[PDB]
Amino acid sequence: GSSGSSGMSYSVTLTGPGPWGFRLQGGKDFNMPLTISRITPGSKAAQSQLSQGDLVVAIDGVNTDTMTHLEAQNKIKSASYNLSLTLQKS
């Protein structure tokens, strides 16, 4: 069928430069949801709403379900002024 359940979709604003002490997990090229692999303790990512396990939907306003693990990651670099990341509550 067609129907997805949600809990709470949020976003994070990681102003740059960060750096972004957070890695991505799974991905489209992995047939997995882009989740917050890991996060650096004391980093901005660990001072926002970014948490390990989070479900990334869009990066800087760009869905990930379509973007591969790399692509998504490449987006992190692409970011400049700010690094927005839309997550979802599993």
Swiss-Prot record:
All copies of domain PDZ, residue ranges: 8-90
Tissue: Expressed primarily in adult heart and skeletal muscle, and detected at lower levels in lung. Isoforms are expressed in a tissue-specific manner. Isoform 1, isoform 3 and isoform 5 are expressed in heart, whereas isoform 2, isoform 4 and isoform 6 are expressed in skeletal muscle.
Residues recorded as bearing Phosphoserine in the entry: S51
Top-level taxon in the UniProt lineage: Eukaryota
TM ranges: none
Location within or outside the cell: Cytoplasm, Perinuclear region; Cell projection, Pseudopodium; Cytoplasm, Cytoskeleton; Cytoplasm, Myofibril, Sarcomere, Z line
Quaternary structure note: Interacts via its LIM domains with various PKC isoforms. Interacts via its PDZ domain with the ACTN2 C-terminal region. Interacts with MYOZ1, MYOZ2 and MYOZ3.
Job of this protein: May function as an adapter in striated muscle to couple protein kinase C-mediated signaling via its LIM domains to the cytoskeleton.
Name of the molecule in the record: LIM domain-binding protein 3
Range of the intact protein held here: 1 to 83 of 723
